[PDB]
Amino acid sequence: GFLHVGKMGFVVTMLKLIQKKLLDKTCDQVMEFSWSALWNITDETPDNCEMFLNFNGMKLFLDCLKEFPEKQELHRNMLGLLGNVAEVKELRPQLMTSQFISVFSNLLESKADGIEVSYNACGVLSHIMFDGPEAWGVCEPQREEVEERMWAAIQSWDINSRRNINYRSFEPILRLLPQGISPVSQHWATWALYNLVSVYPDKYCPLLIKEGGMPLLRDIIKMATARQETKEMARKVIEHCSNFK
Amino acid sequence: GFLHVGKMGFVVTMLKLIQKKLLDKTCDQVMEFSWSALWNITDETPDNCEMFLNFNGMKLFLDCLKEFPEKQELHRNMLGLLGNVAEVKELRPQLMTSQFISVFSNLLESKADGIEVSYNACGVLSHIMFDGPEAWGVCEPQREEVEERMWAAIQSWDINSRRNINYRSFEPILRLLPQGISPVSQHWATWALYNLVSVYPDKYCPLLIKEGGMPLLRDIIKMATARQETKEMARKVIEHCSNF
Questions:
Q1: A46: domain CATH number?
Q2: A74 touches chain B (CB under 8 A)
Q3: Which cysteine pairs are joined by S-S bonds (chain A)?
Protein backbone atom coordinates (compact mmCIF):
# COMPACT_ATOMS: atom_id res chain seq x y z
CA GLY A 1 0.00 0.00 0.00
CA PHE A 2 1.00 3.64 -0.51
CA LEU A 3 -0.26 7.22 -0.26
CA HIS A 4 0.36 9.80 -3.02
CA VAL A 5 -1.22 13.11 -1.91
CA GLY A 6 -0.25 16.74 -2.25
CA LYS A 7 1.29 18.30 0.85
CA MET A 8 2.11 22.00 0.63
CA GLY A 9 4.19 21.64 3.78
CA PHE A 10 6.53 19.17 2.08
CA VAL A 11 6.84 21.28 -1.07
CA VAL A 12 7.31 24.62 0.71
CA THR A 13 9.86 23.18 3.15
CA MET A 14 11.95 21.75 0.27
CA LEU A 15 11.88 24.98 -1.77
CA LYS A 16 12.85 27.02 1.30
CA LEU A 17 15.85 24.74 1.87
CA ILE A 18 16.75 25.12 -1.83
CA GLN A 19 16.45 28.92 -1.66
CA LYS A 20 18.73 29.07 1.41
CA LYS A 21 21.42 26.88 -0.13
CA LEU A 22 21.10 28.99 -3.29
CA LEU A 23 21.74 32.14 -1.24
CA ASP A 24 24.65 30.37 0.46
CA LYS A 25 25.95 29.47 -3.04
CA THR A 26 26.18 25.93 -1.62
CA CYS A 27 25.13 22.76 -3.44
CA ASP A 28 25.75 20.26 -0.62
CA GLN A 29 23.93 17.13 0.59
CA VAL A 30 20.96 19.12 1.87
CA MET A 31 20.50 20.88 -1.48
CA GLU A 32 20.61 17.57 -3.36
CA PHE A 33 18.35 15.87 -0.80
CA SER A 34 15.84 18.68 -1.25
CA TRP A 35 15.49 18.27 -5.02
CA SER A 36 15.48 14.48 -4.63
CA ALA A 37 12.60 14.82 -2.18
CA LEU A 38 10.62 16.92 -4.66
CA TRP A 39 11.34 14.24 -7.26
CA ASN A 40 10.03 11.59 -4.87
CA ILE A 41 6.79 13.29 -3.87
CA THR A 42 5.85 14.10 -7.47
CA ASP A 43 6.25 10.46 -8.62
CA GLU A 44 2.72 9.63 -9.91
CA THR A 45 1.47 12.57 -7.79
CA PRO A 46 0.11 15.46 -9.88
CA ASP A 47 -0.98 17.47 -6.84
CA ASN A 48 2.62 17.96 -5.71
CA CYS A 49 3.61 18.87 -9.29
CA GLU A 50 0.97 21.60 -9.26
CA MET A 51 2.21 22.84 -5.87
CA PHE A 52 5.84 22.95 -7.04
CA LEU A 53 4.80 25.23 -9.91
CA ASN A 54 2.41 27.35 -7.82
CA PHE A 55 5.16 28.14 -5.29
CA ASN A 56 7.42 29.35 -8.15
CA GLY A 57 9.70 26.31 -8.08
CA MET A 58 10.69 26.89 -11.71
CA LYS A 59 12.60 30.00 -10.64
CA LEU A 60 14.70 27.96 -8.20
CA PHE A 61 15.23 25.33 -10.91
CA LEU A 62 16.65 27.94 -13.32
CA ASP A 63 18.66 29.70 -10.60
CA CYS A 64 20.21 26.38 -9.49
CA LEU A 65 20.98 25.45 -13.13
CA LYS A 66 22.83 28.77 -13.60
CA GLU A 67 24.57 28.73 -10.21
CA PHE A 68 25.72 25.07 -10.19
CA PRO A 69 26.42 24.16 -13.84
CA GLU A 70 28.66 21.16 -13.01
CA LYS A 71 26.72 19.44 -10.19
CA GLN A 72 25.52 16.44 -12.16
CA GLU A 73 23.53 14.85 -9.37
CA LEU A 74 21.72 18.14 -8.78
CA HIS A 75 20.76 18.35 -12.46
CA ARG A 76 19.57 14.75 -12.41
CA ASN A 77 17.26 15.39 -9.45
CA MET A 78 15.84 18.57 -10.99
CA LEU A 79 15.16 17.03 -14.40
CA GLY A 80 13.62 13.94 -12.83
CA LEU A 81 11.25 16.22 -10.93
CA LEU A 82 10.46 18.19 -14.08
CA GLY A 83 9.90 14.86 -15.82
CA ASN A 84 7.15 14.09 -13.29
CA VAL A 85 5.69 17.59 -13.76
CA ALA A 86 5.51 17.25 -17.54
CA GLU A 87 3.46 14.04 -17.27
CA VAL A 88 0.51 16.17 -16.04
CA LYS A 89 -1.29 17.40 -19.15
CA GLU A 90 -3.00 20.20 -17.21
CA LEU A 91 0.37 21.65 -16.10
CA ARG A 92 2.27 21.54 -19.42
CA PRO A 93 0.88 24.93 -20.62
CA GLN A 94 3.07 26.43 -17.88
CA LEU A 95 6.15 24.81 -19.42
CA MET A 96 5.45 26.43 -22.84
CA THR A 97 7.73 29.43 -22.54
CA SER A 98 10.83 30.24 -24.55
CA GLN A 99 12.78 30.51 -21.31
CA PHE A 100 11.85 26.96 -20.26
CA ILE A 101 11.82 25.27 -23.69
CA SER A 102 15.28 26.61 -24.51
CA VAL A 103 16.58 25.04 -21.29
CA PHE A 104 14.96 21.64 -21.97
CA SER A 105 16.24 21.71 -25.57
CA ASN A 106 19.79 22.57 -24.47
CA LEU A 107 19.80 19.83 -21.82
CA LEU A 108 19.25 17.18 -24.52
CA GLU A 109 23.04 17.42 -24.95
CA SER A 110 23.89 17.17 -21.24
CA LYS A 111 26.39 14.46 -20.28
CA ALA A 112 25.48 14.69 -16.59
CA ASP A 113 24.92 11.45 -14.61
CA GLY A 114 25.37 9.10 -17.55
CA ILE A 115 22.30 9.83 -19.68
CA GLU A 116 19.74 10.78 -16.99
CA VAL A 117 19.68 14.54 -17.54
CA SER A 118 19.46 14.21 -21.33
CA TYR A 119 16.94 11.37 -21.00
CA ASN A 120 14.65 13.27 -18.63
CA ALA A 121 14.90 16.48 -20.63
CA CYS A 122 13.84 14.36 -23.61
CA GLY A 123 10.90 12.96 -21.66
CA VAL A 124 9.68 16.44 -20.73
CA LEU A 125 9.90 17.42 -24.38
CA SER A 126 8.25 14.17 -25.48
CA HIS A 127 5.18 14.91 -23.35
CA ILE A 128 5.21 18.51 -24.61
CA MET A 129 5.48 17.37 -28.25
CA PHE A 130 2.50 15.04 -27.71
CA ASP A 131 0.23 18.09 -27.29
CA GLY A 132 0.84 19.17 -30.90
CA PRO A 133 2.21 22.17 -32.80
CA GLU A 134 -0.48 24.69 -31.78
CA ALA A 135 0.46 24.23 -28.10
CA TRP A 136 4.01 25.36 -28.97
CA GLY A 137 2.93 28.84 -30.07
CA VAL A 138 5.75 31.32 -30.68
CA CYS A 139 8.17 29.58 -28.27
CA GLU A 140 11.84 29.63 -29.24
CA PRO A 141 13.64 27.52 -30.30
CA GLN A 142 11.26 26.34 -33.02
CA ARG A 143 9.51 23.02 -32.60
CA GLU A 144 11.08 21.41 -35.67
CA GLU A 145 14.59 22.22 -34.43
CA VAL A 146 13.87 20.81 -30.96
CA GLU A 147 12.50 17.68 -32.63
CA GLU A 148 15.75 17.24 -34.60
CA ARG A 149 17.70 17.51 -31.34
CA MET A 150 15.49 14.92 -29.62
CA TRP A 151 16.11 12.35 -32.39
CA ALA A 152 19.85 13.09 -32.09
CA ALA A 153 19.82 12.65 -28.30
CA ILE A 154 17.90 9.35 -28.36
CA GLN A 155 20.23 8.00 -31.06
CA SER A 156 23.29 8.97 -29.01
CA TRP A 157 22.28 6.91 -25.93
CA ASP A 158 23.71 3.42 -25.42
CA ILE A 159 20.71 1.07 -25.46
CA ASN A 160 22.41 -0.85 -22.63
CA SER A 161 23.14 2.28 -20.56
CA ARG A 162 23.14 1.77 -16.84
CA ARG A 163 20.30 3.77 -15.31
CA ASN A 164 19.61 5.81 -12.19
CA ILE A 165 15.83 5.70 -12.55
CA ASN A 166 12.82 3.78 -11.26
CA TYR A 167 9.27 3.41 -12.56
CA ARG A 168 6.40 1.97 -10.55
CA SER A 169 4.21 2.23 -13.66
CA PHE A 170 4.81 2.60 -17.39
CA GLU A 171 1.46 4.21 -18.14
CA PRO A 172 2.81 7.77 -18.75
CA ILE A 173 5.26 6.22 -21.22
CA LEU A 174 2.68 3.80 -22.66
CA ARG A 175 0.33 6.69 -23.46
CA LEU A 176 2.91 8.05 -25.91
CA LEU A 177 2.78 4.89 -28.06
CA PRO A 178 -0.70 4.86 -29.72
CA GLN A 179 -0.53 8.22 -31.45
CA GLY A 180 0.83 9.79 -34.60
CA ILE A 181 0.84 13.37 -33.36
CA SER A 182 4.53 13.15 -32.41
CA PRO A 183 6.59 10.24 -33.76
CA VAL A 184 9.63 11.46 -31.82
CA SER A 185 7.69 11.20 -28.53
CA GLN A 186 6.72 7.66 -29.51
CA HIS A 187 10.38 6.94 -30.25
CA TRP A 188 11.54 8.25 -26.87
CA ALA A 189 8.84 6.15 -25.20
CA THR A 190 9.80 3.02 -27.11
CA TRP A 191 13.49 3.58 -26.35
CA ALA A 192 12.65 4.06 -22.68
CA LEU A 193 11.00 0.61 -22.60
CA TYR A 194 13.72 -1.06 -24.67
CA ASN A 195 16.55 0.18 -22.44
CA LEU A 196 14.77 -0.87 -19.24
CA VAL A 197 13.75 -4.35 -20.37
CA SER A 198 17.35 -4.73 -21.59
CA VAL A 199 19.11 -3.77 -18.34
CA TYR A 200 16.39 -4.79 -15.82
CA PRO A 201 14.21 -7.48 -17.47
CA ASP A 202 13.23 -9.12 -14.17
CA LYS A 203 11.49 -5.93 -13.06
CA TYR A 204 10.31 -4.32 -16.29
CA CYS A 205 9.26 -7.20 -18.55
CA PRO A 206 6.51 -8.12 -16.02
CA LEU A 207 5.45 -4.50 -15.49
CA LEU A 208 5.35 -3.87 -19.24
CA ILE A 209 3.45 -7.11 -19.91
CA LYS A 210 1.06 -6.56 -16.99
CA GLU A 211 0.20 -3.03 -18.18
CA GLY A 212 -0.71 -4.07 -21.73
CA GLY A 213 2.46 -3.05 -23.56
CA MET A 214 2.66 -6.00 -25.94
CA PRO A 215 -0.47 -5.07 -27.98
CA LEU A 216 0.62 -1.40 -28.05
CA LEU A 217 4.05 -2.32 -29.41
CA ARG A 218 2.45 -4.63 -31.96
CA ASP A 219 0.29 -1.69 -33.08
CA ILE A 220 3.47 0.38 -33.46
CA ILE A 221 4.88 -2.09 -35.99
CA LYS A 222 1.62 -1.76 -37.99
CA MET A 223 1.55 2.04 -37.72
CA ALA A 224 2.31 4.19 -40.76
CA THR A 225 3.46 7.17 -38.68
CA ALA A 226 5.94 5.10 -36.64
CA ARG A 227 9.49 5.49 -37.92
CA GLN A 228 11.22 2.27 -38.91
CA GLU A 229 13.84 2.82 -36.18
CA THR A 230 10.92 2.82 -33.73
CA LYS A 231 9.38 -0.31 -35.27
CA GLU A 232 12.68 -2.16 -34.91
CA MET A 233 13.04 -1.25 -31.21
CA ALA A 234 9.42 -2.32 -30.68
CA ARG A 235 10.17 -5.68 -32.28
CA LYS A 236 13.14 -6.18 -29.96
CA VAL A 237 11.13 -5.32 -26.81
CA ILE A 238 8.34 -7.74 -27.79
CA GLU A 239 11.01 -10.37 -28.47
CA HIS A 240 12.75 -9.89 -25.11
CA CYS A 241 9.44 -9.83 -23.21
CA SER A 242 8.30 -12.99 -25.01
CA ASN A 243 11.48 -14.86 -24.11
CA PHE A 244 11.15 -13.65 -20.51
CA LYS A 245 7.85 -15.54 -20.42
CA GLY B 1 9.42 8.29 -11.95
CA PHE B 2 12.16 8.46 -9.31
CA LEU B 3 15.82 7.64 -8.81
CA HIS B 4 17.22 4.12 -8.37
CA VAL B 5 16.61 3.63 -4.64
CA GLY B 6 19.14 0.79 -4.42
CA LYS B 7 22.04 2.46 -6.22
CA MET B 8 21.50 5.67 -4.28
CA GLY B 9 21.28 4.07 -0.84
CA PHE B 10 18.05 5.98 -0.43
CA VAL B 11 16.49 3.83 2.31
CA VAL B 12 19.49 4.45 4.58
CA THR B 13 19.47 8.16 3.72
CA MET B 14 15.91 8.28 5.07
CA LEU B 15 16.74 6.28 8.21
CA LYS B 16 19.77 8.51 8.86
CA LEU B 17 17.54 11.59 8.69
CA ILE B 18 15.01 9.88 10.98
CA GLN B 19 17.72 9.16 13.55
CA LYS B 20 18.99 12.74 13.44
CA LYS B 21 15.49 14.19 13.81
CA LEU B 22 14.84 11.73 16.66
CA LEU B 23 17.89 12.93 18.62
CA ASP B 24 16.84 16.53 17.92
CA LYS B 25 13.40 15.57 19.33
CA THR B 26 11.99 17.28 16.22
CA CYS B 27 9.11 15.73 14.27
CA ASP B 28 8.95 18.37 11.57
CA GLN B 29 8.08 18.30 7.87
CA VAL B 30 11.36 16.58 6.97
CA MET B 31 10.82 13.84 9.57
CA GLU B 32 7.29 13.20 8.31
CA PHE B 33 8.58 13.22 4.71
CA SER B 34 11.22 10.62 5.54
CA TRP B 35 8.69 8.15 6.96
CA SER B 36 6.26 8.97 4.13
CA ALA B 37 8.95 8.11 1.59
CA LEU B 38 9.77 4.83 3.37
CA TRP B 39 6.09 3.87 3.31
CA ASN B 40 5.88 4.66 -0.40
CA ILE B 41 9.08 2.92 -1.52
CA THR B 42 8.38 -0.29 0.42
CA ASP B 43 5.09 -0.73 -1.44
CA GLU B 44 5.37 -4.16 -3.10
CA THR B 45 9.17 -3.94 -2.76
CA PRO B 46 10.39 -6.63 -0.34
CA ASP B 47 14.04 -5.61 -0.62
CA ASN B 48 13.35 -2.12 0.72
CA CYS B 49 11.38 -3.75 3.55
CA GLU B 50 14.34 -5.95 4.45
CA MET B 51 16.70 -2.94 4.27
CA PHE B 52 14.43 -1.17 6.77
CA LEU B 53 14.61 -4.04 9.27
CA ASN B 54 18.31 -4.73 8.70
CA PHE B 55 19.21 -1.13 9.54
CA ASN B 56 17.17 -1.30 12.77
CA GLY B 57 14.16 0.67 11.56
CA MET B 58 12.08 -1.17 14.18
CA LYS B 59 13.97 0.63 16.97
CA LEU B 60 13.55 4.00 15.22
CA PHE B 61 9.84 3.17 14.90
CA LEU B 62 9.51 2.36 18.62
CA ASP B 63 11.56 5.39 19.66
CA CYS B 64 9.49 7.70 17.45
CA LEU B 65 6.25 6.30 18.91
CA LYS B 66 7.62 7.01 22.39
CA GLU B 67 9.03 10.47 21.65
CA PHE B 68 6.10 11.66 19.47
CA PRO B 69 3.02 9.98 20.97
CA GLU B 70 0.56 12.50 19.46
CA LYS B 71 1.95 13.05 15.93
CA GLN B 72 -0.85 11.56 13.83
CA GLU B 73 0.55 11.65 10.28
CA LEU B 74 3.84 10.26 11.59
CA HIS B 75 2.00 7.31 13.18
CA ARG B 76 0.04 6.67 9.96
CA ASN B 77 3.20 6.79 7.81
CA MET B 78 5.12 4.47 10.16
CA LEU B 79 2.28 1.93 10.32
CA GLY B 80 1.77 2.00 6.55
CA LEU B 81 5.45 1.18 6.19
CA LEU B 82 5.10 -1.70 8.67
CA GLY B 83 2.03 -2.87 6.76
CA ASN B 84 4.26 -3.31 3.72
CA VAL B 85 6.91 -5.12 5.76
CA ALA B 86 4.25 -7.44 7.17
CA GLU B 87 3.19 -8.50 3.65
CA VAL B 88 6.57 -10.22 3.19
CA LYS B 89 6.22 -13.73 4.64
CA GLU B 90 9.97 -14.18 5.04
CA LEU B 91 10.24 -10.98 7.13
CA ARG B 92 7.28 -11.65 9.45
CA PRO B 93 9.33 -13.79 11.92
CA GLN B 94 11.23 -10.60 12.77
CA LEU B 95 7.96 -9.06 14.02
CA MET B 96 7.12 -11.88 16.49
CA THR B 97 8.18 -10.41 19.83
CA SER B 98 6.11 -9.38 22.83
CA GLN B 99 7.43 -5.84 22.43
CA PHE B 100 6.32 -5.52 18.79
CA ILE B 101 3.06 -7.48 19.10
CA SER B 102 2.00 -5.43 22.12
CA VAL B 103 2.56 -2.19 20.22
CA PHE B 104 0.57 -3.35 17.18
CA SER B 105 -2.24 -4.52 19.47
CA ASN B 106 -2.36 -1.21 21.37
CA LEU B 107 -2.50 0.78 18.12
CA LEU B 108 -5.77 -0.94 17.16
CA GLU B 109 -7.42 1.71 19.38
CA SER B 110 -5.57 4.68 17.87
CA LYS B 111 -7.71 7.56 16.58
CA ALA B 112 -4.86 9.05 14.52
CA ASP B 113 -5.94 10.15 11.02
CA GLY B 114 -9.42 8.69 11.30
CA ILE B 115 -9.07 4.91 11.05
CA GLU B 116 -5.72 4.73 9.25
CA VAL B 117 -3.41 3.77 12.14
CA SER B 118 -5.89 1.28 13.60
CA TYR B 119 -6.45 -0.17 10.12
CA ASN B 120 -2.72 -0.37 9.32
CA ALA B 121 -1.97 -2.07 12.65
CA CYS B 122 -4.84 -4.47 11.99
CA GLY B 123 -3.35 -5.29 8.59
CA VAL B 124 0.03 -6.05 10.14
CA LEU B 125 -1.60 -8.36 12.70
CA SER B 126 -3.78 -9.93 9.98
CA HIS B 127 -0.75 -11.07 7.97
CA ILE B 128 0.96 -12.20 11.18
CA MET B 129 -2.04 -14.29 12.24
CA PHE B 130 -2.26 -15.84 8.78
CA ASP B 131 0.89 -17.77 9.71
CA GLY B 132 -0.92 -19.69 12.46
CA PRO B 133 -0.59 -20.27 16.21
CA GLU B 134 2.78 -21.99 15.70
CA ALA B 135 4.31 -18.73 14.43
CA TRP B 136 2.89 -17.02 17.52
CA GLY B 137 5.48 -18.03 20.08
CA VAL B 138 4.88 -17.52 23.75
CA CYS B 139 4.44 -13.98 22.47
CA GLU B 140 2.33 -11.91 24.85
CA PRO B 141 -0.35 -10.59 24.66
CA GLN B 142 -2.15 -13.84 23.94
CA ARG B 143 -3.08 -14.52 20.33
CA GLU B 144 -6.80 -14.81 21.11
CA GLU B 145 -6.83 -11.58 23.12
CA VAL B 146 -5.29 -9.68 20.20
CA GLU B 147 -7.80 -11.33 17.88
CA GLU B 148 -10.66 -10.04 20.05
CA ARG B 149 -9.21 -6.53 19.87
CA MET B 150 -8.95 -6.93 16.08
CA TRP B 151 -12.64 -7.88 15.70
CA ALA B 152 -13.53 -4.87 17.84
CA ALA B 153 -11.43 -2.41 15.84
CA ILE B 154 -12.83 -3.57 12.50
CA GLN B 155 -16.43 -3.21 13.73
CA SER B 156 -15.68 0.31 14.97
CA TRP B 157 -14.61 1.62 11.53
CA ASP B 158 -17.05 3.52 9.32
CA ILE B 159 -17.52 1.26 6.28
CA ASN B 160 -18.02 4.47 4.30
CA SER B 161 -14.68 6.03 5.37
CA ARG B 162 -12.78 7.98 2.76
CA ARG B 163 -9.23 6.73 2.97
CA ASN B 164 -5.59 7.81 3.27
CA ILE B 165 -4.21 4.68 1.60
CA ASN B 166 -4.23 3.29 -1.91
CA TYR B 167 -3.33 -0.02 -3.52
CA ARG B 168 -1.75 -0.78 -6.87
CA SER B 169 -2.83 -4.42 -6.42
CA PHE B 170 -5.19 -6.30 -4.11
CA GLU B 171 -3.09 -9.48 -4.21
CA PRO B 172 -1.65 -9.27 -0.63
CA ILE B 173 -5.20 -8.72 0.68
CA LEU B 174 -6.79 -11.39 -1.54
CA ARG B 175 -4.40 -14.08 -0.26
CA LEU B 176 -6.02 -13.62 3.16
CA LEU B 177 -9.42 -14.72 1.82
CA PRO B 178 -9.05 -18.47 0.94
CA GLN B 179 -8.03 -19.75 4.37
CA GLY B 180 -9.48 -20.76 7.72
CA ILE B 181 -6.29 -20.48 9.78
CA SER B 182 -7.22 -16.92 10.82
CA PRO B 183 -10.87 -15.97 10.31
CA VAL B 184 -10.10 -12.52 11.72
CA SER B 185 -7.46 -11.96 9.02
CA GLN B 186 -10.08 -12.98 6.46
CA HIS B 187 -12.55 -10.51 7.99
CA TRP B 188 -10.05 -7.63 7.93
CA ALA B 189 -9.34 -8.37 4.28
CA THR B 190 -13.04 -8.57 3.36
CA TRP B 191 -13.66 -5.26 5.15
CA ALA B 192 -10.75 -3.61 3.30
CA LEU B 193 -12.24 -4.70 -0.04
CA TYR B 194 -15.78 -3.73 0.98
CA ASN B 195 -14.77 -0.24 2.15
CA LEU B 196 -12.76 0.54 -0.99
CA VAL B 197 -15.32 -0.74 -3.53
CA SER B 198 -18.04 1.10 -1.58
CA VAL B 199 -16.19 4.40 -1.55
CA TYR B 200 -14.06 4.26 -4.74
CA PRO B 201 -15.86 1.78 -7.05
CA ASP B 202 -14.50 3.29 -10.29
CA LYS B 203 -10.96 2.44 -9.25
CA TYR B 204 -11.40 -0.66 -7.14
CA CYS B 205 -14.28 -2.60 -8.70
CA PRO B 206 -12.28 -3.24 -11.93
CA LEU B 207 -9.12 -4.00 -9.97
CA LEU B 208 -10.86 -6.53 -7.73
CA ILE B 209 -12.55 -8.27 -10.68
CA LYS B 210 -9.40 -8.30 -12.78
CA GLU B 211 -7.33 -9.85 -9.98
CA GLY B 212 -9.69 -12.78 -9.33
CA GLY B 213 -11.49 -11.42 -6.28
CA MET B 214 -14.92 -12.73 -7.25
CA PRO B 215 -14.22 -16.49 -6.93
CA LEU B 216 -12.40 -15.84 -3.65
CA LEU B 217 -15.40 -13.96 -2.26
CA ARG B 218 -17.82 -16.66 -3.45
CA ASP B 219 -15.73 -19.29 -1.66
CA ILE B 220 -15.98 -17.28 1.59
CA ILE B 221 -19.78 -17.37 1.33
CA LYS B 222 -19.58 -21.19 1.39
CA MET B 223 -16.77 -21.54 3.93
CA ALA B 224 -17.32 -23.22 7.30
CA THR B 225 -14.76 -21.01 9.07
CA ALA B 226 -15.90 -17.57 7.85
CA ARG B 227 -18.12 -15.72 10.31
CA GLN B 228 -21.65 -14.77 9.25
CA GLU B 229 -20.78 -11.07 9.10
CA THR B 230 -17.75 -11.84 6.90
CA LYS B 231 -20.00 -13.76 4.51
CA GLU B 232 -22.53 -10.92 4.45
CA MET B 233 -19.85 -8.35 3.54
CA ALA B 234 -18.54 -10.70 0.84
CA ARG B 235 -22.03 -10.93 -0.67
CA LYS B 236 -22.33 -7.13 -0.77
CA VAL B 237 -18.89 -6.80 -2.39
CA ILE B 238 -19.93 -9.30 -5.08
CA GLU B 239 -23.20 -7.40 -5.53
CA HIS B 240 -21.42 -4.05 -5.88
CA CYS B 241 -18.87 -5.43 -8.34
CA SER B 242 -21.51 -7.27 -10.39
CA ASN B 243 -23.61 -4.12 -10.73
CA PHE B 244 -20.46 -2.18 -11.58
A1: 1.25.10.10
A2: no
A3: none
